[PDB]
């Protein structure tokens, strides 16, 4: 079953030929649809759509389910890439989980897949209904989908979330590989072959496309650039949030051109392909995780520690409509920390008070099956992960000198880094929540007040609003500069030695003021959670 040479373009022709498109139609070729100066009914429809789907459904509903994305703008080595017939390209089962998805967005996803995926690879499209209410997602969907012959709806009767839905999808799939997509995606030209070719070469590779943005207001598709605009890897922070970071120099050097995988410490986890056999062998998903949140970080750690490769294939591009309770997500994160993170789980627990509580109350469930998996696969430990996969990571102290919150006596609020503070921004005063996160601060042996969830940031004294800056102390040669050294004095003042001034919690932004221990706005409690 193993033929010589490379697949021909005709061998890889798609499952369905895209009908000719109207270049001046709304959102043609992936262009912006500006929905502006609407009649009175029209503004009510758009507003309704926005509240139901958290994207401009008014726009989606006026854009073709068949829209092309214009010329192929990938790097030339992606466009010219040829694939060996031995080992053969494996078949794939597409698995899409949906819950109350717009019709326009779900069926544009399914049409996109059929117009872009080689017929010889596309075994089936499995749509897993996670207990949708919308009636059009019941019999109308079932009947509409029959014409495509390979599309099947699987009904999860009660809402159990993405994890359970994906495992149900995988249990009925007959493809050699599984390809997970969300229900609001558009495939670019050539997206599937690079994922399936990489699994063919390396059966322990878990491979993700480069995920392009579809704009939630205009549905503009951010097209790839032919230079390959400097790529991102996935990471995590010590709140166990998924994030994106630049490639290190060593990875830029290894990748001779864009057909080379990007090795990624973590994956976003919405869009990826895996050998169906490897998905089973590596322990699928932790069945005791509820709804969703954390499963992509858990699977990242498990794949790396248990001997697989987590890769982004930049020749593979899929667009996704990016958008924008806590107990379920925190419990999922505690279960992954308890199984994979060894002694480093305490770094996470100190930053997420709800997680520390779930651990102390032992409400995270039995993990014996995931511990047995880790033992049976002889997985490496989290020290090995950090040394070998993510040697660039900032790793906080396992046992920091001190951590907690900084509560102001004057206004009874907490010092707070605010949203999206990666340095260079002032701080705010915010209601004390006791949750850690944006109110988490550590005290160091060098008298620094660190906020160290993603970057190592230091409270940095200035004439204006105090700021967070990247700490100057980071190893043996370096020093903590005066602006980043603080004394918590017997009068409860936070004193900067360099500027001879005290932090005040008055005004919009905490600032330095002449030291006045009578001023309750200058009195701070460095409390423990």
């Amino acid at each position: 079953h193993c033929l010589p040479g490379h697949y021909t373009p005709v061998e890889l022709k798609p499952f369905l030929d895209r009908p000719l498109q109207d270049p001046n139609a709304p959102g043609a070729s992936g262009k912006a649809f500006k929905t502006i100066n609407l009649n009175s009914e029209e503004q009510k429809e758009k507003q309704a759509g926005e509240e139901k789907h958290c994207f401009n459904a008014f726009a989606s509903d006026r854009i073709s389910l068949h829209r092309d994305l214009g010329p192929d703008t990938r790097p030339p080595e992606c466009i010219e890439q040829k694939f060996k017939r031995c080992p053969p390209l494996p078949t794939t089962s597409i698995i899409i989980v949906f819950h109350n998805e717009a019709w326009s967005t779900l069926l544009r996803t399914v049409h996109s897949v059929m117009y872009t995926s080689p017929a010889i690879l596309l075994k089936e499209i499995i749509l897993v209904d996670d207990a949708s209410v919308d009636e059009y997602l019941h019999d109308k969907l079932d009947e509409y989908v029959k014409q495509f012959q390979i599309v099947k709806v699987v009904r999860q009767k009660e809402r159990k979330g993405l994890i359970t839905a994906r495992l149900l999808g995988a249990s009925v799939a007959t493809g050699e590989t599984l390809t997970f997509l969300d229900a609001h995606c558009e495939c670019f030209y050539g997206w599937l072959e690079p994922l399936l070719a990489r699994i063919a070469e390396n059966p322990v590779a878990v491979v993700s496309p480069d995920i392009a943005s579809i704009d939630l207001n205009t549905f503009e598709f951010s097209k790839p650039s032919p230079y390959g605009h400097s790529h991102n890897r996935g990471n995590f922070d010590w709140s166990l949030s998924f994030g994106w970071e630049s490639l290190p120099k060593h990875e830029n050097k290894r990748r001779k051109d864009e057909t080379y995988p990007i090795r990624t410490p973590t994956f976003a986890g919405g869009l990826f392909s895996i050998s169906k056999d490897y998905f089973e062998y590596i322990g699928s998903y932790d069945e005791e995780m509820e709804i969703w949140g954390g499963e992509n970080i858990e699977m990242s750690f498990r794949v790396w520690q248990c001997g697989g490769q987590l890769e982004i294939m930049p020749c593979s591009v899929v667009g996704h409509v990016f958008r924008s309770g806590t107990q379920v997500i925190t419990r999922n994160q505690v279960r992954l920390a308890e199984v994979w993170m060894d002694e480093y789980k305490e770094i996470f627990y100190r930053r997420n008070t709800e997680a520390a509580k779930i651990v102390k109350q032992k409400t995270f469930g039995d993990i014996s099956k995931r511990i047995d998996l880790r033992q049976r696969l002889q997985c490496k430990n989290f020290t090995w992960y950090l040394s070998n996969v993510y040697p660039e990571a900032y790793v906080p102290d396992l046992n920091p000198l001190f951590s907690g919150y900084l509560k102001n006596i004057g206004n009874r609020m907490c010092l707070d880094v605010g949203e999206n503070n990666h340095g260079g921004k002032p701080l705010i005063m915010y209601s004390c929540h006791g949750l850690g996160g944006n109110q988490y601060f550590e005290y160091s042996a060098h008298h620094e007040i660190r906020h160290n969830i993603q970057k190592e940031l230091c409270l940095h004294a200035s004439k204006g609003p105090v700021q967070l800056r990247e700490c100057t102390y980071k190893g043996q040669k370096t020093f903590a500069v005066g602006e980043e050294q603080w004394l918590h004095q017997k009068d409860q003042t936070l004193y900067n030695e360099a500027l001879h001034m005290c932090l005040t919690g008055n005004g919009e932004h905490p600032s330095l003021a002449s030291c006045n221990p009578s001023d309750p706005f200058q009195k701070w409690i460095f409390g423990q959670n």
Partner: peptide, 12 residues
């Protein structure tokens, strides 16, 4: 009062 940021994946 805000949660520990997540709910939808962020883009690059």
């Amino acid at each position: 009062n805000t949660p520990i940021p997540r709910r939808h994946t962020r883009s690059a």
